[PDB]
Amino acid sequence: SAVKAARYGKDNVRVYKVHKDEKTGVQTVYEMTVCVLLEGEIETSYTKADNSVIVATDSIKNTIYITAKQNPVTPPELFGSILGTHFIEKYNHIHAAHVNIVCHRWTRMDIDGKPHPHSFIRDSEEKRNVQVDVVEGKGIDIKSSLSGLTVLKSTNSQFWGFLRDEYTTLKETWDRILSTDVDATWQWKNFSGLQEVRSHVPKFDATWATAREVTLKTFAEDNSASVQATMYKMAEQILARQQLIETVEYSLPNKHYFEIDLSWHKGLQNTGKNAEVFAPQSDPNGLIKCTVGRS
Amino acid sequence: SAVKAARYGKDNVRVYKVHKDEKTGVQTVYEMTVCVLLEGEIETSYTKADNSVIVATDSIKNTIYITAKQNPVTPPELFGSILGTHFIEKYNHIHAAHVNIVCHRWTRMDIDGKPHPHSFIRDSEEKRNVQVDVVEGKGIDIKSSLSGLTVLKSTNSQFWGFLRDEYTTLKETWDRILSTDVDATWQWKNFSGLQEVRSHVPKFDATWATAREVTLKTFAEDNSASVQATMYKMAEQILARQQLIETVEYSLPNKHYFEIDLSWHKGLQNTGKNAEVFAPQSDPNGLIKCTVGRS
Amino acid sequence: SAVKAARYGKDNVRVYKVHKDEKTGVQTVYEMTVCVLLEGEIETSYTKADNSVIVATDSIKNTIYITAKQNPVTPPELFGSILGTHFIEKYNHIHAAHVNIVCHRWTRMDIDGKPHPHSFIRDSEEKRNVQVDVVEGKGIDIKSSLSGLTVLKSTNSQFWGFLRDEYTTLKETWDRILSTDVDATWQWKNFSGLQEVRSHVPKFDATWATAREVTLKTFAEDNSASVQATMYKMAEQILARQQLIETVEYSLPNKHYFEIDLSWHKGLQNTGKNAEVFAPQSDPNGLIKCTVGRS
Amino acid sequence: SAVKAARYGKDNVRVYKVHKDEKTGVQTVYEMTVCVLLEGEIETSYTKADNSVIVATDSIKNTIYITAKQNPVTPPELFGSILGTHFIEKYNHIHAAHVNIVCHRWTRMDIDGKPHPHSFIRDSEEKRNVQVDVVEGKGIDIKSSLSGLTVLKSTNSQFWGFLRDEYTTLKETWDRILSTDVDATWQWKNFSGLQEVRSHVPKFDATWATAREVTLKTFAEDNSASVQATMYKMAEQILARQQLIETVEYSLPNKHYFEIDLSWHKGLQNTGKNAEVFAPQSDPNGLIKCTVGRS
Ligand SMILES: O=c1[nH]c(=O)c2nn[nH]c2[nH]1
Ligand SMILES: O=c1[nH]c(=O)c2nn[nH]c2[nH]1
Ligand SMILES: O=c1[nH]c(=O)c2nn[nH]c2[nH]1
Ligand SMILES: O=c1[nH]c(=O)c2nn[nH]c2[nH]1
Ligand code: NA
Ligand code: NA
Ligand code: NA
Ligand code: NA
């Protein structure tokens, strides 16, 4: 037998950082969960019990805190790139670092219509994520994403004209509820190294904001023919607004809300035009994916 | 042996309702999870296999949907009171209904700075809940609550002057992070029946809003001496603003964020005044509770 | 306003302890999650910011580890009683301790049909729990429980003869699936203090084992007329086998598995006698509770 | 823009099937959660709102139940292969099916030392999974796995001789706790189609059993030099025992249990040789992966 692939590191490293503006007194907080996995010339730790090649996962944890102390942690694309580059430059035998960061929302509180200097609220479990792969000799690959954005529209969704055969019971519809949890990823063109990532720093937050805005607007305004057709519209727009993106991927559950026939009870009318009370279904759910790139 | 207490019913009943304003085209959605448990003269179902006394839990489920179809579902205090009263009036041998409702957030989307007629976002997993106990001959008891409100302040929290003995290692501090998930419950004075609950309908949303506002403002503005002292301030204010409330209960975890000493690494300064990077602790956590009533 | 009730302490304290038999080399592990909440003369911490009355929750955490170091951690009824008694005896102004312990399964591995001296498997998320309330002057109240015991029988469950009215759609049945997660609690007669708890030590594990055995046997062998009737049979037997128990409480979800009509597809027969494939329902679920005591 | 990749289908389809032996009266239950995603000539559903190419996800759900009604559901490798082949043969324009199945444990109860004909217990949340990719013209690729197997050994684990530099604080150790949740996957050689999968049917359960046995024995018996070295030993053995496997992949968290220094309290000795009480750490955790194939 032979080691065909190997990677190891530290997962679920929770990190908080505060920035204090001495002039204004305003404080800003960042909280993330970080995972770093390394690859390189480490096969002998598996095959020969040679621990000399192992940078201990505990040390990886220390390095994350030290790096957060000495560098900005925002945008996460930059922090992840710094963190990954560290490992491949510091250790001769480590040739790739894989850094995943999940950013948690701490949104500044408004009290009496003014932003509070040091108090924050978690408004939703929506996340902003990055995956950064730093590979010696092959630059920096960054996939940015948002996830956990849960939305619902109560009308202006349709689904008709699908294939019908002996396995089909679903009725065509011209008015249904559509609800999903959005997972959207945009993949950046490969960067040559940290200097290049640094040069594009302002684009990271801007492109996240654009992705979020396009998602919300398109969902709200499209008279949707299907989840497939609506998601494609979103992806198309994001690619149009940022030329440094190569592909956009969406993965969307179709979280079903079923009509409830109540006609058995006193002829009560609760279907079609008369539908008011629905039963949200926890499972199963549709799952629709697409990756859109440039012609 | 003897049956000392018994209750049975249906849990985890997910319900969605939409309201459509025909004049304006605006739609408003409500989504809840409902639990209804009944008590009464039902001992024989346990002791003698006498199912004749059982209103089937499946029927309870049907009744929830039917009741939602024929009545407003907001405020939840009113809906719960209608639902519970139904069971004790319909069935001679059922003498108490216990209704728990969890309300899920569907917040109307703003697109291009205007509120959208039919699109919604789940902004946070914060819930508004009610517990309604309808007891034949003893009126309607309602406990209203908010839960899952997660907040953090980065300074203006202290903790010093606590008891110190041979079990104590905690250092006194004049500046720490304070973060919690707020669970706040206000218990209404007993209501004589549905007519009385109906008479106070506007107070339900108003008091929820007040509880939320007082919680957020006090947390943000109190230079906190402890979780105990800050929570008492919140409870005191709520009782002052609504005379129909008898008690207010808060249950607050103290979600710890620990300093990380980095001095072992190149004398790096990250404690006390120099603390910037912290380690959020998943467990253990402090848990502090209090119930405040009137003198 | 006035403090009507208050309690505070440390939740989610994870503890592991190992015992090493030097003679045989056999090691035995225990893992628990502990919560300790105190009550007493502590109102001034809430009302006047008087921290002098506060035994810090961090100190409570230390005390749990120290107590585990110096005492047996099994049975949990004994450990909880020691832990709670500590607080009320050590601190003059603390008058009640509330100790909750969840015990996690670490079951010794059998390798090649022999028990391994130091390797363990988590066989299921079933828990053994205790709630111990130690109140100055009022002795020690102990509620023991098992939870998370998930079972299913594929036949020998019935449900017919329930009330039928205009809210009823459920068909009577003489053969259905029954599946539940068992939560069973037995409440001990009040103990005067630690000496008395110590005197009954062997009864704790024995009664847990009996409760578990009676639950499993009755579930498997009863041709069940309802969840109500079957659970009563369980409770009756436990009370008969241990005279130091005052009440037994069961709380049982009815986790529904629905028939799937497939007759629309090529007349395929999958209902009643021909039912083979079913759809497990995640929600809603029935919830049935009962507390049984002595005549 | 252009569609670069697309797949869609139904996730979280819960399925139960019962088998009844009429001769013996013995019943056997199977419960699974199934996900089916299709690929093929479906781009126009995204780009042109052409639903004619869509086999509705609701129909996919129906097909899963129908297929379960007419075929054995065990071993899951066979069921997944039947299910996937169905889609690529039935629909001209569908060219790949991706089937994921998670199998839930229902273990027959022993009552009074005899196996019960129709009662079952969920002994642990360990799963047996399959991923089956059926691609028109390219046969059937099957990855089988076990997951959620949680184990702990209290001694006979070491970790010393790792790299030490200015980022390192971890002390070398010759005796520590090792605990993990095992995720192990074995990838079968490509199969030409259903006939070939059918021919190897007995190997599927046998190889699952072997993987499980080798995992447990090696974990229990290896005086482990590291997680890396122990996992390699497991993978090597599995490959040796089944020639139709091409690679074995393990992904193992290192779930840390920390010593607790109690010397501050009355000189209490709880570290090194004297360590008895430990603090299980929920996060962070090491994460170690490896893929082993043939020379
Ligand atoms: O088994 C281990 N492998 C590792 O890579 C490691 N790093 N810290 N502790 C460790 N333990
Ligand atoms: O065992 C049962 N008890 C009940 O109360 C019930 N209601 N519907 N189905 C039921 N099954
Ligand atoms: O606000 C706090 N209250 C307490 O009771 C406590 N105990 N430790 N830290 C604490 N912080
Ligand atoms: O938007 C949808 N896309 C689909 O593929 C589908 N299948 N059933 N319902 C559906 N809705
Ligand atoms: Na390198
Ligand atoms: Na009544
Ligand atoms: Na006392
Ligand atoms: Na095909």
Domains and their CATH numbers in chain A: 1-295 (3.10.270.10)
Output the CA torsion sign for D62, D63, D65, D70.
positive
> Could you count the other beta carbons within 10 Å of the beta carbon of residue A286?
22
Closest to B231 measured CA to CA, from B248, B243, B245: B248
3-class DSSP assignment, residue A268 = coil
Chain centre distance of CA C276: 34
Which atom of ligand 2 lies nearest, measured to the CA of B58? 8
Chain centre distance of CA C129: 5
Contact assignment for A4 to D49 by CB distance below 8 Å? no
Q: What are phi and psi for residue C154, nearest 5 degrees?
A: -95, -5
Per-residue tokens: B27: 């739609």
Closest to B6 measured CA to CA, from B40, B51, B33, B30: B40
* Alpha-carbon dihedral B227, B229, B231, B237, rounded to 10 degrees: -160
Alpha-carbon span A6 to C29, nearest angstrom: 32
Pocket test for ligand 1, best of A7, A11, A36, A57 (most atoms within 8 A of CB): A57
Closest to D56 measured CA to CA, from B184, A151, C38, A172: A172
Closest to B34 measured CA to CA, from B109, B100, B85, B110: B100
The burial of D171, by beta-carbon neighbours within 10 Å (0-12 exposed, 13-18 middle, 19 or more buried), is given as exposed
Query: What single DSSP character describes residue C83?
Result: H
Closest to B7 measured CA to CA, from C52, C289, D239: C289
What is chain A's Cα-based Rg?
24
Nearest-Cα distance to chain C for D202, in Å, is 23
D157 contact partners, CB below 8 Å, separation of at least 6: D175, D176, D177, D178, D223, D224
Alpha-carbon span A17 to A11, nearest angstrom: 18
Per-residue tokens: C36: 């300790």
Half-sphere exposure of C78 (CA within 13 A, CB side): 16
C166 reaches A (C-beta below 8 A): yes
Alpha-carbon span A227 to A162, nearest angstrom: 13
Alpha-carbon span A260 to A17, nearest angstrom: 49
Contact assignment for B264 to D169 by CB distance below 8 Å? yes
Closest to C152 measured CA to CA, from D19, D118, D124, D114: D118
Alpha-carbon span B50 to B54, nearest angstrom: 8
Alpha-carbon span D151 to C116, nearest angstrom: 13
Distance linking the first and last C-alpha atoms of chain B: 43
C162 contact partners, CB below 8 Å, separation of at least 6: B51, B52, B54, B55, B56, C168, C170, C172
Residue in D with minimal Cα distance to B261:
D169
Residue in C with minimal Cα distance to A261:
C169
Binding site members of A for O2: 57, 254
* Alpha-carbon dihedral D257, D262, D268, D269, rounded to 10 degrees: 40
A263-272 own/partner pairs: CB under 8 Å, 24+ apart: A264/C169, A265/B62, A265/B66, A265/C166, A265/C167, A266/C166, A268/B66, A268/B69, A268/B70, A270/B69
DSSP A117-161: EEEEE---S-EEEEEEEEETTTEEEEEEEEEEEEEEESSSB-B-S
Per-residue tokens: A232: 């494609």
List chain A residues with CB under 8 Å of D91: 163
Contact assignment for B279 to A15 by CB distance below 8 Å? yes
- List the single residue in D17, D112, D119 with the smallest CB-CB distance to C276: D17
> Could you count the other beta carbons within 10 Å of the beta carbon of residue C51?
21
Alpha-carbon span D193 to C219, nearest angstrom: 44
Query: Ligand 2 within 6 A of C254 CB?
Result: yes
Query: What single DSSP character describes residue D157?
Result: B
Per-residue tokens: B255: 């979600």
- List the single residue in A228, A284, A291 with the smallest CB-CB distance to D10: A284
Q: Where are the beta strands (DSSP E) in D204-254?
A: 245-254
Range 220-249 of A in CB contact (< 8 A) with D: 225-226, 228-229, 231-232, 235-236, 239-240, 247, 249
Alpha helices in chain A (DSSP H): 43-47, 57-70, 76-90, 194-199, 201-221, 227-241
The helix or strand, by DSSP H or E, that contains position A177, with its residue range, turns out to be none
A260-265 own/partner pairs: CB under 8 Å, 24+ apart: A260/B65, A262/B65, A262/B66, A262/B69, A264/C169, A265/B62, A265/B66, A265/C166, A265/C167
Output the CA torsion sign for A162, A163, A165, A168.
negative
Query: Ligand 2 within 6 A of B121 CB?
Result: no
Alpha-carbon span D132 to B37, nearest angstrom: 44
Burial B77-89 (b: 16+ CB within 10 A, else e): bbbbbbbbbbbbe
3-class DSSP assignment, residue B22 = coil
> Could you count the other beta carbons within 10 Å of the beta carbon of residue B21?
10
Query: Is C57 an active-site residue?
Result: yes
The answer to whether C81 and C142 have CB atoms below 8 angstroms apart is yes
Closest to B123 measured CA to CA, from B112, B113, B108, B103: B108
Burial C192-207 (b: 16+ CB within 10 A, else e): eebeebeebeebbeeb
Parallel, antiparallel, or unpaired: how do β-strands B2-20 and B27-40 relate? Answer: antiparallel
A264 reaches C (C-beta below 8 A): yes
Alpha carbon separation from D227 to A40, A265, B93, C246 (Å, rounded): 17, 62, 63, 50
Alpha-carbon span C291 to B94, nearest angstrom: 18
Parallel, antiparallel, or unpaired: how do β-strands A139-153 and C257-259 relate? Answer: unpaired
Alpha-carbon span B237 to B202, nearest angstrom: 20
Closest to B79 measured CA to CA, from C166, C165, A277, C288: A277
A45 contact partners, CB below 8 Å, separation of at least 6: A51, A53, A54, D226, D228, D229
Alpha-carbon span A207 to A142, nearest angstrom: 13
Alpha carbon separation from D278 to A138, B124, B283, C128 (Å, rounded): 44, 36, 14, 20
**What's the resolution in A?**
1.7
Alpha carbon separation from C247 to A262, C143, C185, C186, D9 (Å, rounded): 42, 10, 8, 6, 51
Closest to D166 measured CA to CA, from B267, A16, A49: B267
Alpha-carbon span D64 to D17, nearest angstrom: 12
Ligand-binding site membership of C71 (annotated): no
Closest to D64 measured CA to CA, from D12, D5, D19: D12
Alpha-carbon span D56 to A160, nearest angstrom: 10
The answer to whether B236 and C53 have CB atoms below 8 angstroms apart is no
B54 contact partners, CB below 8 Å, separation of at least 6: B8, B42, B45, C162, C163, C226, C228
Closest to C18 measured CA to CA, from B103, D259, B143: D259
Place of tokens 């008895």: D276
3-class DSSP assignment, residue C266 = coil
The answer to whether B9 and B37 have CB atoms below 8 angstroms apart is yes
